[PDB]
Amino acid sequence: QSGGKVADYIPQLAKFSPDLWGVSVCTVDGQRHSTGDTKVPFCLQSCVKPLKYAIAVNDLGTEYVHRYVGKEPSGLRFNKLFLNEDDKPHNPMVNAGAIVVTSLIKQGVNNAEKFDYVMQFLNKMAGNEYVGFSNATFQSERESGDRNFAIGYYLKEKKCFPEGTDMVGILDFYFQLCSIEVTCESASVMAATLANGGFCPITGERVLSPEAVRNTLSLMHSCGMWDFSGQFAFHVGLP
Amino acid sequence: QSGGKVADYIPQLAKFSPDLWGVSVCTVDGQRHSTGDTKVPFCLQSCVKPLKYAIAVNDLGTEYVHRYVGKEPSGLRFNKLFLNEDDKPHNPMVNAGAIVVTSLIKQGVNNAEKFDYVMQFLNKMAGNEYVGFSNATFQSERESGDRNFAIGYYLKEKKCFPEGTDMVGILDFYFQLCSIEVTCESASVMAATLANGGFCPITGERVLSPEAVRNTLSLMHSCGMWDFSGQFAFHVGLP
Amino acid sequence: QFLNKMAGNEYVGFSNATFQSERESGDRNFAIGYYLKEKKCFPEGTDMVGILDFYFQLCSIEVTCESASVMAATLANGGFCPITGERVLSPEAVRNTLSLMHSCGMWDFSGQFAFHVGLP
Amino acid sequence: LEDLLFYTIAEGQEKIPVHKFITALKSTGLRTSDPRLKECMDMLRLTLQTTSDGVMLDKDLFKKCVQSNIVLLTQAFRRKFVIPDFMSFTSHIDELYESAKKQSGGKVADYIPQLAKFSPDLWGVSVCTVDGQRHSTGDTKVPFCLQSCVKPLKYAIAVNDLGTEYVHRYVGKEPSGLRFNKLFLNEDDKPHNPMVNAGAIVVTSLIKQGVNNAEKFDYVMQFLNKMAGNEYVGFSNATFQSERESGDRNFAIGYYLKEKKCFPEGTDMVGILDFYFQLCSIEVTCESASVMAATLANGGFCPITGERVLSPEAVRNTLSLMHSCGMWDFSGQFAFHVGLPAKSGVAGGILLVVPNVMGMMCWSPPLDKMGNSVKGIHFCHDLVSLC
Ligand SMILES: NC(=O)CC[C@H](N)C(=O)O
Numbered sequence: 005q006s007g008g009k010v011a012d013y014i015p016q017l018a019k020f021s022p023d024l025w026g027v028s029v030c031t032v033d034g035q036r037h038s039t040g041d042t043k044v045p046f047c048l049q050s051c052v053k054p055l056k057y058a059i060a061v062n063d064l065g066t067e068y069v070h071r072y073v074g075k076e077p078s079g080l081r082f083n084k085l086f087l088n089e090d091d092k093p094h095n096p097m098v099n100a101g102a103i104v105v106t107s108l109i110k111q112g113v114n115n116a117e118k119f120d121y122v123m124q125f126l127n128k129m130a131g132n133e134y135v136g137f138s139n140a141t142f143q144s145e146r147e148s149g150d151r152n153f154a155i156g157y158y159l160k161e162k163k164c165f166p167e168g169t170d171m172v173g174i175l176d177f178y179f180q181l182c183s184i185e186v187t188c189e190s191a192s193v194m195a196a197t198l199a200n201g202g203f204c205p206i207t208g209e210r211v212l213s214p215e216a217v218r219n220t221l222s223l224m225h226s227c228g229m230w231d232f233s234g235q236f237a238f239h240v241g242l243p
Numbered sequence: 244q245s246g247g248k249v250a251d252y253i254p255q256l257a258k259f260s261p262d263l264w265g266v267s268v269c270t271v272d273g274q275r276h277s278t279g280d281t282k283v284p285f286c287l288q289s290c291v292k293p294l295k296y297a298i299a300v301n302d303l304g305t306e307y308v309h310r311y312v313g314k315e316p317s318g319l320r321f322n323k324l325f326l327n328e329d330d331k332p333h334n335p336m337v338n339a340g341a342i343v344v345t346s347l348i349k350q351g352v353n354n355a356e357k358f359d360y361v362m363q364f365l366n367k368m369a370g371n372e373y374v375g376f377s378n379a380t381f382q383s384e385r386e387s388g389d390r391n392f393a394i395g396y397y398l399k400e401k402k403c404f405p406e407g408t409d410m411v412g413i414l415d416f417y418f419q420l421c422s423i424e425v426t427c428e429s430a431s432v433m434a435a436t437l438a439n440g441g442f443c444p445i446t447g448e449r450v451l452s453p454e455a456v457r458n459t460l461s462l463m464h465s466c467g468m469w470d471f472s473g474q475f476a477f478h479v480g481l482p
Numbered sequence: 483q484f485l486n487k488m489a490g491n492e493y494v495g496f497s498n499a500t501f502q503s504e505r506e507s508g509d510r511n512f513a514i515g516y517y518l519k520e521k522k523c524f525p526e527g528t529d530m531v532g533i534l535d536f537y538f539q540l541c542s543i544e545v546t547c548e549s550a551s552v553m554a555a556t557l558a559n560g561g562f563c564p565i566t567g568e569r570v571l572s573p574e575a576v577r578n579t580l581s582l583m584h585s586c587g588m589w590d591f592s593g594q595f596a597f598h599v600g601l602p
Numbered sequence: 603l604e605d606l607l608f609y610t611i612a613e614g615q616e617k618i619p620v621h622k623f624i625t626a627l628k629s630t631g632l633r634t635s636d637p638r639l640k641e642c643m644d645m646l647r648l649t650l651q652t653t654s655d656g657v658m659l660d661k662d663l664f665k666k667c668v669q670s671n672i673v674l675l676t677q678a679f680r681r682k683f684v685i686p687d688f689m690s691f692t693s694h695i696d697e698l699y700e701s702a703k704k705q706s707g708g709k710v711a712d713y714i715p716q717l718a719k720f721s722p723d724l725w726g727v728s729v730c731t732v733d734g735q736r737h738s739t740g741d742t743k744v745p746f747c748l749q750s751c752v753k754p755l756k757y758a759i760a761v762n763d764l765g766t767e768y769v770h771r772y773v774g775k776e777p778s779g780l781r782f783n784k785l786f787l788n789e790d791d792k793p794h795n796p797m798v799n800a801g802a803i804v805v806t807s808l809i810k811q812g813v814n815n816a817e818k819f820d821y822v823m824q825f826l827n828k829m830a831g832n833e834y835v836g837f838s839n840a841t842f843q844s845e846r847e848s849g850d851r852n853f854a855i856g857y858y859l860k861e862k863k864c865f866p867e868g869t870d871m872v873g874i875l876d877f878y879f880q881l882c883s884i885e886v887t888c889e890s891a892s893v894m895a896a897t898l899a900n901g902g903f904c905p906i907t908g909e910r911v912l913s914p915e916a917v918r919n920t921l922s923l924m925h926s927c928g929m930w931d932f933s934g935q936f937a938f939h940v941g942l943p944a945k946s947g948v949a950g951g952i953l954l955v956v957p958n959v960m961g962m963m964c965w966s967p968p969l970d971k972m973g974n975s976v977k978g979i980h981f982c983h984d985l986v987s988l989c
Pocket residue numbers: 749750782799849852879882946947948949
């Protein structure tokens with residue numbers, strides 16, 4: 005297959021060649037295998053949202069997490085800015101829900117220790133694999149991502165944020181979470197910890213509560229593919 | 244629980260008592276059990292749509308069925324009048340998709356044989372149980388149902404109908420299909436034929452193809468509960 | 483300076499108290515500005531944040547009713563100040579802004595205002 | 603010519619096992635992950651699955667297979683490298699490591715609270731030579747930030763890209779004699795040298811002035827990766843979120859420089875300051891940083907790749923600047939006792955350079971009151987006293 009249309013916005017993402025292709029496999033027990041360009045690092049744009057939702061749930065309880073976000077598919081593009089009948093984001097998967105669930109994690113703590121905590125937790129989840137940070141793609145999407153700023157200002161205007169929260173710092177933190185880079189082999193440990201009962205497939209450590217894993221699996225099955233989620237559940241039927 | 248708000252439109256449907264409540268259960272093997280007032284007949288409004296979708300798929304092939312209807316959730320009420328980017332209904336569960344899939348079932352033959360055909364399939368699925376027809380709720384919702392007429396005329400204006408199809412007759416046939424009434428015990432035989440691989444749990448015969456059963460099960464799991472489908476999959480996770 | 487020329491050197495102040503507010507609390511305007519920046523409907527080489535702050539400053543100007551009586555009177559004339567008689571606005575600009583105020587100068591109430599009052 | 607050295611490795615037998623071939627290769631100090639011998643390494647890999655003998659290499663296969671690395675292997679296996687008897691050198695390094703482990707020091711980090719989380723007993727030393735010999739001990743695999751140790755590197759980048767006259771049009775080349783946090787300029791209202799914070803800010807203001815930060819960081823990271831031989835050059839975002847909400851002396855210095863109008867025309871101070879924080883937030887390991895200070899120990903040529911990175915003029919200029927004022931107020935004492943071009947930082951790293959011989963890296967989170975690691979200074983003193 006050929007496809008095309010790599011990336012127009014975020015010009016740092018457009019520098020990748022279109023013929024890059026790699027697939028990594030890791031099972032629950034530890035059986036792993038990879039082919040292609042699996043050693044090349046790449047960013048984790050929008051793929052960290054189920055992970056950060058799991059972190060927020062495991063830290064704060066699902067009722068307190070869903071006090072501010074819904075659990076329904078939006079039915080439109082993730083860039084489209086609108087709320088439900090209750091003036092809330094539709095799901096954590098879309099940009100508004102991602103911003104709100106970034107607001108929940110460690111509300112009384114500054115950005116540096118928040119990033120340190122989430123990076124330590126994700127490294128524990130990854131079995132101390134390679135988890136980097138592409139600062140080149142963080143300088144981009146910050147000076148060029150304008151739709152996310154509009155969504156954040158709309159959410160601040162609708163007063164859907166938790167009290168005593170700065171919108172600009174939370175949006176920058178969300179950009180930092182989106183700017184995390186992993187390889188395909190390192191991301192094979194991802195989607196395997198939550199494929200298990202919250203335990204790491206390699207180290208066997210206790211990482212996530214089973215409730216958080218079940219909730220994020222249900223959310224990925226429901227609206228984990230934007231408008232293509234219905235067709236994906238119809239044909240593939242996998243989270 | 245109490246609830247409230249029985250039915251505003253379809254004034255024939257508003258005559259039911261608010262404390263009326265019963266549950267019937269039937270399994271794949273054949274054993275069944277029911278409690279309460281299960282013998283009382285009631286209309287199958289908006290519940291026959293997975294059944295008619297299964298009939299249409301089993302008779303026409305899923306590619307020809309989905310040539311006109313998409314397979315994505317809408318995210319809004321079933322009475323809402325809008326289409327997707329491709330000027331098509333989002334899914335067969337909403338009213339527009341139901342109208343389009345009723346337009347496909349035996350398009351070359353008039354209503355008199357079409358109703359007999361779908362009633363024969365419904366009786367074969369039900370194992371010759373009670374499948375009645377509440378004419379009182381068919382005379383109502385035809386003189387008072389106005390949103391369906393607007394939706395059908397919008398679909399005709401968008402030219403999403405098959406060639407050589409009358410809008411008014413197909414809409415009347417859709418009303419007739421929605422006006423079919425069954426009891427709780429009789430409807431318990433339904434949703435068990437498609438719980439099996441298309442085989443009737445009572446007669447042991449074959450009714451539906453496994454592909455049609457899988458397709459309608461996936462669609463009902465995805466967007467079979469309107470805007471509450473996401474919450475239903477989150478909490479219950481059953482079609 | 484030009485608005486003072488239009489006002490005939492009347493009282494035109496600047497309420498800084500209402501400028502500090504609506505800057506830390508006006509969030510819908512920021513969303514609109516970022517949406518316009520995302521849609522690329524700005525002139526080339528223009529900073530969105532500074533332009534939005536300038537727009538807030540223009541909205542933060544304060545005048546009295548007597549000073550605002552000279553307002554809507556230079557443009558009620560042929561662009562000349564009713565008091566000083568100086569050349570202020572070109573007649574084309576006055577005609578265009580009068581037509582725009584007559585058309586959509588009252589938000590959703592503009593149609594009813596033109597139906598009943600029928601004045602810009 | 604490879605046959606005689608292969609027979610010298612051999613004891614008379616024509617067939618030599620691969621286990622014997624990898625034996626004593628570590629004695630030569632050349633690691634197996636060198637891209638120069640990546641042809642030979644890929645040869646060994648492909649012959650390991652397909653040999654039909656089991657762990658064998660044979661003379662004639664070695665003769666026919668090696669087609670581009672004859673010179674390097676001949677220089678390596680006849681002890682033609684600049685540092686012979688590498689076992690004695692590693693024993694000396696281990697003895698100095700054991701001697702330096704006795705000291706305690708203290709005062710790890712007060713400001714940048716993310717930097718204060720490091721263990722005070724962490725200690726590691728990495729060594730790399732010009733030819734390609736390398737050896738590391740201790741905690742050499744732990745990543746750490748390159749705070750103030752990237753300033754000679756960015757100065758070399760700026761000089762190599764802009765010319766020394768254009769670089770020094772804005773920055774002087776004299777030591778200051780005070781701390782790097784001190785806010786003052788020279789008689790001509792210019793930063794004293796690129797090593798202190800003001801000079802670092804001004805030289806970050808010069809690199810690709812017409813391009814935004816997104817491509818500037820990619821450019822400097824490409825140069826750093828070419829210098830490091832595609833080793834681990836990461837980015838610690840945790841220490842970049844800190845030192846931005848808590849680093850106030852740098853903001854005051856930047857505003858003072860903006861007031862003095864020493865910046866190039868059409869430059870935004872805040873963006874350049876953020877880019878400077880990003881440049882100082884780059885993290886590396888001791889092994890990865892050992893590849894650095896060896897490219898500039900050579901004539902701008904990377905010891906691992908063998909390619910060309912920097913002009914010799916830039917290398918000479920940054921070596922002279924590191925020799926002159928590479929240790930803040932301790933530069934005079936360091937030249938008096940050690941007399942080698944080295945650069946320190948608030949992280950704890952020491953970029954000790956021996957010109958045309960070998961490069962080093964010493965990591966110690968505890969710091970002196972002046973701004974240098976106590977263990978690294980003691981290690982350098984013991985090294986210059988012994989060898
Ligand atoms: N040694 C250093 O000062 C490192 C530079 C760093 N930006 C700081 O101001 O701390």
